Every structure is written in C-alpha cells, then in structure tokens.
Design a protein around this ligand. Structure first.
Ligand SMILES: O=C(O)c1ccccc1-c1cccnc1
Ligand SMILES: [Fe+3]
Ligand SMILES: [Fe+3]
Length: 298
C-alpha cells in the first residue's frame, strides 16, 4: 500500500529503516558526519541491524544519539550489544525508562524475553552492563536539538506502559509514537489497542497527541511508516479503536463471559502479526492483562 512504507532501506531524504520492519531501528541523517537512531529493538537482531547500519554509516563514531520510547524488551534490547560499537552515542530516554535499566529485577525480565528469541546456536556480541549505558534522561516537553535541521520534542505518553514517551519533529510533521497508538493491523488498516498499564492514561495521551499540528508521517514501534490519512488520523483512530474494545469487553461480560473468552479470541485474531518477535504466551497473557485493566477502569 502507498500509505504504508514497509521495506528496509531509505524512507525519506533523511530517514532509513534498519533491520526487520516488524521491530525496526530508524536511522536519521543529522548532517554530513552525524547520525541518530530511534527505537532500540530486540537483542537477537544486533548483527542484522549493525550490518544494515554500516551500509549507510561509513564511520559509526558519527552515531551521536539513540532515542528510546520505552522500557519494553522489544524497544531497548539492542542497547547493551551495539553500545560498545558506538563510542560517541548518547542514549536519550525518559527518567522512568532509565530507572528500569538500574533495576536488577527489571533487567532480568528484559534479558529473559530477548533470549527466548535467539535462533539456535546464535551467540550475542559482548555487552555493556545495563547500568553502565551512556544514558541521558530527558523530560516531558524537552526539545532535543539533534542537528541543524533536526529538532524533536519529547512528549510524555503513558498508558501502554508507565514510562512511555514519543518524539515529535514538527518541521517534518513526523511523530515517532512507539506503542502508544497500539499495533497497526496490516491486513485491515486499523489500530489494535495495546493497553498494558493504565487505560485512563492511554486515552489521555491520545487526546493530547491528537492536538499536535497535523501529522504527515507516523512511525510506530512496529510495522513501518504511515503517511497520508493514516498519519493525519492516527491518534483519533487509535482512541476510537480503544473505546470499541471497551464496549466489546462490556458486551461480552454482560452475556456472562469470562475475560478468558475474549482474551483467546483476541489472541487468535491478533497474535499472528507479532509471532516472530513475541513469545505467544506473552501475546495471550498481554491480551489478558489488557482486558483486566479495561475491566477494572470500566
Ligand atoms: O508492546 C508490544 O509491542 C506488544 C504487542 C502485543 C502484545 C504484547 C506486547 C508487549 C507486552 C509487554 C511487553 N512487551 C511487549
Ligand atoms: Fe511496548
Ligand atoms: Fe512493542
């Protein structure tokens, strides 16, 4: 489809997709000798993303920033493995996201999930300690002056998770939105909600994002770049899909169903898209957690 760019390589004059479209790392060209990365992928893609990076970046000491939307294992798994190969990089993440990397228990969960995704006999490169990452915490509303023609605003966007932020390039009307709008359904063209921490926060983040100057390019955590009407309408559509799921939950409960019934149906209808980077137990359990959240707050 012409409104979804979903191939590795160049996406715009300044922007490339590295790795797999399902868990991509974006590469911004900031100048002749300066680059940034956006989103932090899954650990097992280290050599793939590194190889792709080196096709565009002849000297990786020119990689100066790495912007991170949130602490989930599929959005920061590359950091310890590519860190050592990027001697000038500064990781830019929220305060709560940075805090997660200082927690032994939180780090354990991330490492276990990423290691479930290794192909057999696959060995990972030498890793920085999670608590030694070259991180700089960024605040809600902060302007990241990345280069002469790259200025991105941090916007708090809690709900999917309690640390989540998005990054807005107003010059290009371009929003890196992480998972805050949900998972874009490639077959049907609609947003699937991903409410895994707080429904009220998730919806209020979408209300605020809807107020941004009209979007031209919308870049979520999975699936590529959305443009045209999909970008312009994305936040509003994500919000109305979340409400649709609430009504659906209420309708079935009112017929005496357990949360497990709609959970299995959502896993069946939606779990196939992420099967290659998400353990299926996690998808089904995530569907259950989401319905538990919607059921409590509705
Ligand atoms: O956030 C996602 O990308 C996602 C999408 C569908 C199902 C589960 C997750 C998820 C849940 C928890 C931590 N990581 C990922
Ligand atoms: Fe997530
Ligand atoms: Fe994700």
């Amino acid at each position: 489809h012409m409104l979804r760019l979903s191939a590795p390589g160049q996406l715009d004059d300044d922007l490339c997709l590295l790795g797999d479209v399902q868990v991509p790392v974006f590469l911004l060209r900031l100048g002749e000798a300066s680059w940034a990365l956006v989103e932090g992928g899954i650990s097992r893609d280290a050599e793939l993303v590194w190889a792709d990076l080196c096709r565009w970046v002849a000297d990786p000491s020119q990689v100066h920033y790495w912007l991170i939307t949130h602490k989930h294992y599929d959005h920061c798994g590359l950091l310890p493995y590519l860190c050592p190969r990027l001697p000038n990089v500064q990781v830019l993440a929220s305060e709560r996201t940075c805090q997660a990397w200082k927690s032994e228990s939180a780090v354990r969960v991330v490492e276990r999930l990423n290691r479930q995704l290794l192909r057999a006999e696959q060995r990972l490169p030498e890793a920085c300690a999670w608590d030694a990452l070259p991180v700089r915490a960024v605040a809600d509303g902060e302007w990241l002056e990345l280069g002469p023609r790259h200025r991105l605003q941090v916007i708090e966007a809690h709900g999917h998770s309690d640390d989540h932020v998005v990054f807005y390039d107003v010059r290009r009307r371009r929003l890196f939105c992480g998972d805050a709008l949900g998972e874009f359904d490639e077959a049907e063209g609609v947003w699937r909600p991903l409410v895994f921490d707080d429904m009220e926060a998730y919806l209020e983040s979408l209300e605020r994002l809807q107020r941004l100057p009209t979007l031209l390019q919308l870049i979520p955590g999975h699936g590529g770049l959305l443009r045209g009407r999909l970008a312009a309408d994305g936040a509003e559509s994500a919000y109305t899909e979340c409400l649709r799921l609430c009504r659906r939950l209420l309708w079935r409960q009112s017929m005496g169903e357990s949360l497990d019934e709609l959970s299995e149906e959502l896993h069946r209808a939606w779990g196939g898209q992420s099967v290659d980077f998400l353990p299926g137990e996690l998808h089904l359990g995530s569907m259950r957690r989401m319905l538990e959240i919607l059921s409590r707050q509705a």
